[PDB]
Coordinates of C-alpha atoms (C1' of nucleotides) and ligand atoms in Angstrom, one line a residue:
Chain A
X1 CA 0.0 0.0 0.0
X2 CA 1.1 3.5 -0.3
X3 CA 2.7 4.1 2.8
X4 CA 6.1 2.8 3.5
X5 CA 5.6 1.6 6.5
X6 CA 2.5 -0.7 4.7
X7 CA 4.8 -1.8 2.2
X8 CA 7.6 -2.7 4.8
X9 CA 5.0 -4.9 6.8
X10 CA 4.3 -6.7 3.7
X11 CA 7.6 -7.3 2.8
X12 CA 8.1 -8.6 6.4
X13 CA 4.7 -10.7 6.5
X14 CA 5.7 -12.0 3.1
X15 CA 9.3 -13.1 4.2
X16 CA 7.7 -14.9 7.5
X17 CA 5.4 -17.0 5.0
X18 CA 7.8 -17.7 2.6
X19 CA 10.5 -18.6 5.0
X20 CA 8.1 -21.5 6.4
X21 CA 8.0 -22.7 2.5
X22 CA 10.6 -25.7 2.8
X23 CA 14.4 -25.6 2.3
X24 CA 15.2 -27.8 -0.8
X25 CA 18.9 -28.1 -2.0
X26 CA 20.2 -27.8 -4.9
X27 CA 23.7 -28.7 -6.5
X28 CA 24.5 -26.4 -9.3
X29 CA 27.2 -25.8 -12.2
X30 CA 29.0 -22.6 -11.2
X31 CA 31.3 -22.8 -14.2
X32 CA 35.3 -23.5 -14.4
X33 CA 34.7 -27.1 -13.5
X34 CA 33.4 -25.9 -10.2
X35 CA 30.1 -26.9 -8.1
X36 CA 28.2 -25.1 -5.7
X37 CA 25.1 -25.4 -2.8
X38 CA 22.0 -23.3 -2.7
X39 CA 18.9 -23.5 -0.7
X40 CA 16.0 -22.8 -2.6
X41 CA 12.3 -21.8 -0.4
X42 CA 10.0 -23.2 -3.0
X43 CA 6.3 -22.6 -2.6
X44 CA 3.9 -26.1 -2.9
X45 CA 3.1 -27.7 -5.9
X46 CA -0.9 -27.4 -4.8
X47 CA -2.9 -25.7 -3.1
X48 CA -2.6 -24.2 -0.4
X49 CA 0.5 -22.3 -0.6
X50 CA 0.8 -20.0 2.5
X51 CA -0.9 -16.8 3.8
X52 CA -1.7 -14.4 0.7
X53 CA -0.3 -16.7 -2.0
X54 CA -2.5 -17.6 -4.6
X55 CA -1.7 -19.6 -8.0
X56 CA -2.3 -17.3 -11.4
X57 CA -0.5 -19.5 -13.8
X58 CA 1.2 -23.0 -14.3
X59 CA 4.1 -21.3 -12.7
X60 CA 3.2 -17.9 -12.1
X61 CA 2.1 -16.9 -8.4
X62 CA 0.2 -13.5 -6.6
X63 CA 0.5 -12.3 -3.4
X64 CA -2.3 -10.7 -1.6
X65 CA -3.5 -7.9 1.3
X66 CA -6.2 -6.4 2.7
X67 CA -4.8 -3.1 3.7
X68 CA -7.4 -0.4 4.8
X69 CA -10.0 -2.6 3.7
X70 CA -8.7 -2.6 0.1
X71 CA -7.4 -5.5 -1.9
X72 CA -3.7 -5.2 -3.0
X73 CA -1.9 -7.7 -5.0
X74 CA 1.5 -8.2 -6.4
X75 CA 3.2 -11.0 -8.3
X76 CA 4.7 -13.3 -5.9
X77 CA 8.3 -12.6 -6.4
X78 CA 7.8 -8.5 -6.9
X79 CA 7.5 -8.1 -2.8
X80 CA 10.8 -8.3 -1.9
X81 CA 11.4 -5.1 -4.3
X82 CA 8.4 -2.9 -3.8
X83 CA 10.4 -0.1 -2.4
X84 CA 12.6 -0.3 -5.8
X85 CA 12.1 1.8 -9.0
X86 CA 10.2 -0.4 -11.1
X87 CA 11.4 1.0 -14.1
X88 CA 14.7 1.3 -15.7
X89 CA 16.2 3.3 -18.9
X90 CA 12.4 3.2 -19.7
X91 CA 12.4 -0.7 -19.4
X92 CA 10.1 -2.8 -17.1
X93 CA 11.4 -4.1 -13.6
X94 CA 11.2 -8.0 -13.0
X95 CA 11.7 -10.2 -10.6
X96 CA 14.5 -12.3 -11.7
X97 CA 15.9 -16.0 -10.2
X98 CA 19.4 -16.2 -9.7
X99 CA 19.0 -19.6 -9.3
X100 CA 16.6 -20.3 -12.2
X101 CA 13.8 -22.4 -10.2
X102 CA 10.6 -20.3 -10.6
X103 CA 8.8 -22.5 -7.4
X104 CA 11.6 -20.6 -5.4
X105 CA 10.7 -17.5 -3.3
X106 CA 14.4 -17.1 -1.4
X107 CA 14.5 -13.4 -1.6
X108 CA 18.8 -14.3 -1.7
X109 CA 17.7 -16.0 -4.7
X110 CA 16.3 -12.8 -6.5
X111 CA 17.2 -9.6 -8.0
X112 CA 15.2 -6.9 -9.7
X113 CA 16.2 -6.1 -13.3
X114 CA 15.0 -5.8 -17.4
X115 CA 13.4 -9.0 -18.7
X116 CA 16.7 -8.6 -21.0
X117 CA 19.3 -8.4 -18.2
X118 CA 16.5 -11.6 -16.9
X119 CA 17.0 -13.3 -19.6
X120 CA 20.7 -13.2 -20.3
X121 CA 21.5 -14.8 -17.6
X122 CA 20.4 -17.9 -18.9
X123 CA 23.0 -18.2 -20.8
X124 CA 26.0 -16.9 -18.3
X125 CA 28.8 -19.0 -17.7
X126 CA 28.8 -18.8 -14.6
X127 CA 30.4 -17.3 -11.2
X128 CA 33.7 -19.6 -11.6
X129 CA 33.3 -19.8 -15.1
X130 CA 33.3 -15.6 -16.4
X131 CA 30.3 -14.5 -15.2
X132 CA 30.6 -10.4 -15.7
X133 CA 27.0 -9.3 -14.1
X134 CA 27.3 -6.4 -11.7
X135 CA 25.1 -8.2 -9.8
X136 CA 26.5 -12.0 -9.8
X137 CA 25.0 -14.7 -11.2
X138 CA 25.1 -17.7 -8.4
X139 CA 25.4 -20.3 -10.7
X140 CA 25.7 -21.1 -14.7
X141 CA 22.8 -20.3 -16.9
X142 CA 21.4 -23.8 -17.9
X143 CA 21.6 -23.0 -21.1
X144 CA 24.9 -22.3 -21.1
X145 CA 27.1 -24.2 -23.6
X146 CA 27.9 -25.1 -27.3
X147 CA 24.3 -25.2 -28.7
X148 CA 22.9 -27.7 -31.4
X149 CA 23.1 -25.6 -34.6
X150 CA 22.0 -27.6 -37.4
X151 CA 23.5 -25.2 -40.4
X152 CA 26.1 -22.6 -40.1
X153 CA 26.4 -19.7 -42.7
X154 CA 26.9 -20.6 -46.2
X155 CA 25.8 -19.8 -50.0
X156 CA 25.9 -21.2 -53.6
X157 CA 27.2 -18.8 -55.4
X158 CA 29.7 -15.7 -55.2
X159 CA 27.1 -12.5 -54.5
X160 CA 28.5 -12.3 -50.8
X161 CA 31.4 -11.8 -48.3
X162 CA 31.3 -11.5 -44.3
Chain B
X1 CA 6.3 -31.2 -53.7
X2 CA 8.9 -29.2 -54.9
X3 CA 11.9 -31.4 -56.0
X4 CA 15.4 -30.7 -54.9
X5 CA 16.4 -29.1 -58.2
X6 CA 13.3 -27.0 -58.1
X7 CA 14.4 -26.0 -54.2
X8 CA 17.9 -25.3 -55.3
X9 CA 16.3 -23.2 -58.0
X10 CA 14.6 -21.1 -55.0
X11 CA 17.7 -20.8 -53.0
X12 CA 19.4 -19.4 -56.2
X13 CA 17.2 -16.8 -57.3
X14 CA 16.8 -16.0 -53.5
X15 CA 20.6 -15.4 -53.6
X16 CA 20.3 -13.5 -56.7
X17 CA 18.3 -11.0 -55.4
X18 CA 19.6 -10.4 -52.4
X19 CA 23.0 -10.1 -53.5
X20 CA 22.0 -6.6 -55.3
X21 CA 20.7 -5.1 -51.5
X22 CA 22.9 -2.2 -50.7
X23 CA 25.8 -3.8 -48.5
X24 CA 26.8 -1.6 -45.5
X25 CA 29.6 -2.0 -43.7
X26 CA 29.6 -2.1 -40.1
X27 CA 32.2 -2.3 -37.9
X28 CA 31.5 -4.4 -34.9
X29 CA 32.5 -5.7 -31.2
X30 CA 34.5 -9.1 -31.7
X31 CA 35.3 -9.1 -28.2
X32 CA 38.5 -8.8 -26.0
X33 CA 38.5 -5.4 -26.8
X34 CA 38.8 -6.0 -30.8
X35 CA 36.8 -4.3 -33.2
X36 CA 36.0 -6.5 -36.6
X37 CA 33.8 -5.3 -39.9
X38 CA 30.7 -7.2 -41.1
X39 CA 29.0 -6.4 -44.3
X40 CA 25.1 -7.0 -44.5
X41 CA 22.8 -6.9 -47.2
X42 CA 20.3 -5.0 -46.1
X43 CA 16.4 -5.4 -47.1
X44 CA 14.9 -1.8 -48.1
X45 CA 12.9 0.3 -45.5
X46 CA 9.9 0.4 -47.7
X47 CA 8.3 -1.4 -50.4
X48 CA 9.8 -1.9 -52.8
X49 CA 12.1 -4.3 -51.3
X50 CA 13.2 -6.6 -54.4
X51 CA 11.9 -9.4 -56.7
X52 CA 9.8 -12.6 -54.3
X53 CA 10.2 -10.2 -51.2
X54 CA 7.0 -8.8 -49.3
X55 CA 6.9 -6.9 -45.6
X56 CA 4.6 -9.1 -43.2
X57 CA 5.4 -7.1 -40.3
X58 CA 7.9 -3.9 -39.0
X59 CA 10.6 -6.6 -38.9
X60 CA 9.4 -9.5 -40.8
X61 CA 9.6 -10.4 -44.4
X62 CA 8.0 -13.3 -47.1
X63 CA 9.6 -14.4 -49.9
X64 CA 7.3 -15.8 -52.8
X65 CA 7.6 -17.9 -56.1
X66 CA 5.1 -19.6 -58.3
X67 CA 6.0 -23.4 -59.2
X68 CA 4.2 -25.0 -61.7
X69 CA 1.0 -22.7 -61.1
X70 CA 1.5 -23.2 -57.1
X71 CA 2.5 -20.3 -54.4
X72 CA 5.3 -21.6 -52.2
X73 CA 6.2 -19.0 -49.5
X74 CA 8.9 -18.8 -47.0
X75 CA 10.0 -16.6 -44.3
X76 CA 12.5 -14.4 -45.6
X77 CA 15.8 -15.5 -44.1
X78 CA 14.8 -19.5 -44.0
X79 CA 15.1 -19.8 -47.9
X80 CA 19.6 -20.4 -47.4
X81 CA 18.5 -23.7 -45.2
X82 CA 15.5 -25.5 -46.9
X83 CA 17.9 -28.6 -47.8
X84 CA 18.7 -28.8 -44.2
X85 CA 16.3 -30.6 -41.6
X86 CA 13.9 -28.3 -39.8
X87 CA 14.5 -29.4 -36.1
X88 CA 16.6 -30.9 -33.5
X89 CA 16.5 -32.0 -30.0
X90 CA 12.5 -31.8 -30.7
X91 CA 13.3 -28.0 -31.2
X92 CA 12.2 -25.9 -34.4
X93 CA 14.8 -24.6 -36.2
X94 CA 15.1 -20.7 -36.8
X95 CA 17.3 -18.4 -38.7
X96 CA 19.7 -17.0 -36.9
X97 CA 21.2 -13.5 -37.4
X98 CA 25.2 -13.8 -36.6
X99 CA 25.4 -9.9 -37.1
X100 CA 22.1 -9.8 -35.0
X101 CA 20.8 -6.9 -37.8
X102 CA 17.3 -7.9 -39.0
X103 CA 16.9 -6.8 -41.9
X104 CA 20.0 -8.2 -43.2
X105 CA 19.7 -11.2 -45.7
X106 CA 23.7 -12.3 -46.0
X107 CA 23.2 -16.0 -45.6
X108 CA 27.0 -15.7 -44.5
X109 CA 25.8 -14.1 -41.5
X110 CA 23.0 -16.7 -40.8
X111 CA 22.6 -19.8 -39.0
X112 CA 20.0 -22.4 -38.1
X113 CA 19.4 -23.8 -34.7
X114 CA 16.9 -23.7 -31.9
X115 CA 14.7 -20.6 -30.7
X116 CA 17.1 -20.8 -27.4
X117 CA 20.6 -21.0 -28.8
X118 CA 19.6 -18.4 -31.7
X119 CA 18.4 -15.7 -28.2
X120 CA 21.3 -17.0 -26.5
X121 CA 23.7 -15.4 -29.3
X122 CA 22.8 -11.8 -27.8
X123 CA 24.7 -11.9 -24.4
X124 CA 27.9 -14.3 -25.7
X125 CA 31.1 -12.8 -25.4
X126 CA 32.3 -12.9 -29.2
X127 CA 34.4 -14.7 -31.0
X128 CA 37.9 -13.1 -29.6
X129 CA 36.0 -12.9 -25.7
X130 CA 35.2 -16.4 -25.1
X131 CA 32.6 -17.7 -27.5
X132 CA 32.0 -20.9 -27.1
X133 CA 29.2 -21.9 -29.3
X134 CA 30.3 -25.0 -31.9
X135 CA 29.3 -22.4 -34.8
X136 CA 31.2 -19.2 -33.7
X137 CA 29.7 -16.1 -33.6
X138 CA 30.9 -13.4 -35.8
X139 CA 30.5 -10.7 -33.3
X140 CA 30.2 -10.3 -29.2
X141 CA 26.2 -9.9 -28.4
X142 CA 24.6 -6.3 -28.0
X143 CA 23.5 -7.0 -25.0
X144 CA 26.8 -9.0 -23.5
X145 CA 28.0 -6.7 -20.6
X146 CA 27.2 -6.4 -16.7
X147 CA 23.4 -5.6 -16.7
X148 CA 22.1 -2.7 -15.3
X149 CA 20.5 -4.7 -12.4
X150 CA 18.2 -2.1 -10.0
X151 CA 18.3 -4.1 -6.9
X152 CA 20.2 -7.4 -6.0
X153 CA 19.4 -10.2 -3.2
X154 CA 18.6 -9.3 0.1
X155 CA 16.2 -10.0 3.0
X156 CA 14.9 -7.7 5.7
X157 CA 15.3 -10.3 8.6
X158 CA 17.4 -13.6 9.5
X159 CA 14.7 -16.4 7.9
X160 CA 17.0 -17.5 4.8
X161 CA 20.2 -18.6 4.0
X162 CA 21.4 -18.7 0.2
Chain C
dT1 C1' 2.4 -14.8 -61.3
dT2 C1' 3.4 -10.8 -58.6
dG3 C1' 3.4 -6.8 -55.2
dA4 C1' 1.9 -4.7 -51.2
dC5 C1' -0.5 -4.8 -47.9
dT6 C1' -3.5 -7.4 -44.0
dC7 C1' -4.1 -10.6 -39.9
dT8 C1' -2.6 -13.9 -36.1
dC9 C1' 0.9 -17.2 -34.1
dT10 C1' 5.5 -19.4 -31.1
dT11 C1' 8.7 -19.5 -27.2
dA12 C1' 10.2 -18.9 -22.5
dA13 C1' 11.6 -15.5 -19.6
Chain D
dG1 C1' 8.4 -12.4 -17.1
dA2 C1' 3.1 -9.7 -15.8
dG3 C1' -2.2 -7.7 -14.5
dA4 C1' -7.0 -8.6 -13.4
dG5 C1' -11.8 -11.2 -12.7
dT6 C1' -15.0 -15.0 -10.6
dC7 C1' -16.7 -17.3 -7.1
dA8 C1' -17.1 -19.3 -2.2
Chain E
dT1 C1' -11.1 -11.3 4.7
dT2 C1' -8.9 -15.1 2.8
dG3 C1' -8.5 -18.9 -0.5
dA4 C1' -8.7 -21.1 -5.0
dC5 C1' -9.5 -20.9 -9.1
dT6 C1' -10.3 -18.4 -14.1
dC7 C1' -8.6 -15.4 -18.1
dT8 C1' -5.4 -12.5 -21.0
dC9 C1' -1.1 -9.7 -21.4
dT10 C1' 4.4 -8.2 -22.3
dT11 C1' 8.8 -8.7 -24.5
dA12 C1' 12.1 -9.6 -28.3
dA13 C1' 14.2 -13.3 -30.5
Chain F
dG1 C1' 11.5 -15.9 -34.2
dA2 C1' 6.9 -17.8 -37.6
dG3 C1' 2.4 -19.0 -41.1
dA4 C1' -1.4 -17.5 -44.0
dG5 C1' -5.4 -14.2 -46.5
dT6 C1' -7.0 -10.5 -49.8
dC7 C1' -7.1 -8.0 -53.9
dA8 C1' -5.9 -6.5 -58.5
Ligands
MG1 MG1 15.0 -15.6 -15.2
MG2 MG1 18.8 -13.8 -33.1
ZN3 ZN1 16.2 -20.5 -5.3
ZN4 ZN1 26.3 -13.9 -14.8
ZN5 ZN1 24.5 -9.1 -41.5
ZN6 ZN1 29.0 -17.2 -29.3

DNA sequence: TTGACTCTCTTAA
DNA sequence: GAGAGTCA
DNA sequence: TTGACTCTCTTAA
DNA sequence: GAGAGTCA
């Protein structure tokens, strides 16, 4: 809601919900050969999920409040950041998983950035492996690697140089 | 159905025709601080842009020919791989823009693979910064770098651990 | 047979 | 990666 | 008020 | 990153 200190309580409600989710481990690539430990929170696979947490998608989540008798409602990983611009160089804020499991609500598993900058990091190699993100990456992207490309560049004839 | 002479025919005049596109020369991040030049032939702004070739939207183009009294149609930058199988890994295979410029049509700057590994071209590193995909790119992504990330990982109290 | 438009669709964040 | 509505 | 569902939308390849 | 329709 619009005061701070509203928006601070829901953060902290939200972080006493979602740290009752459980702890599930995961072992994860972190590039250079190397292998690391992170402890996901990850909301239940059915209903019900916790306090405020409702299911909007397949793997898309809300959160939701009654403050002053109104209804507010936020996607599920957007809390932690509500106190953030949610805009940047005219691009849209997201919530975006460091470690790249969309059940998981570990706020130390989030950061707030463009669906670009989101994205990339699919594709990063990696803390150990060259990761250059300002804010780090905490493991490889999963889709990091050599790719499957069926055809590479080519032509027929003579019409064209790289 | 088309016969493979009658396909090669298509890739030919396709060639043909794109070969007389202006060619500009752009001079590009390689990676590891090296600059490189690509030269792309570039589709016209506005109609019209050359023989078979039709705008189907602000980015996308059609190229057309009649075969024995029948419209085949293609999207515009497919045409260099229609001998070449169509998926892998269960995966459609796109074109893939190496100089990552749209409305070029240099099949020398194209490749086919997966929706995933043709995105995953915009954050690599470049060809002299670490690429390491089996068909190097010919240029470091436009959007390789660190991010401009708004707000990183944290939590408010003491209930998670990374 | 051809050009220049029109429309909607796919994927995975 | 998102917002919002329908019911109980 | 809170829970459990429903729907469509955004972006840039 | 795609496929397909209309009109002359
Ligand atoms: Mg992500
Ligand atoms: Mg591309
Ligand atoms: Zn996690
Ligand atoms: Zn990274
Ligand atoms: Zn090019
Ligand atoms: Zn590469």
């Amino acid at each position: 809601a619009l005061t701070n200190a509203q928006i601070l309580a829901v953060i902290d409600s939200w972080e006493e919900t979602v740290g009752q989710f459980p702890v599930i481990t995961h072992h994860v690539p972190l590039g250079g050969g190397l292998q690391g430990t992170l402890h996901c929170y990850e909301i239940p696979l059915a209903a019900p999920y916790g306090v405020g947490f409702a299911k909007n998608g397949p793997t898309r989540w809300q959160y939701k409040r009654t403050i002053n008798q109104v209804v507010h409602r936020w996607g599920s990983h957007t809390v932690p950041f509500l106190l953030e611009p949610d805009n940047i160089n005219g691009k849209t804020c997201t919530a975006s998983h460091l470690c790249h499991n969309t059940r998981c609500h570990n706020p130390l598993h989030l950061c707030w950035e463009s669906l670009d900058d989101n994205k990339g990091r699919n594709w990063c190699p990696g803390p150990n492996g060259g990761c250059v993100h300002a804010v780090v990456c905490l493991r490889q992207g999963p889709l990091y690697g050599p790719g499957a490309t069926v055809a590479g560049p080519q032509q027929r004839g003579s019409h064209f140089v790289v």
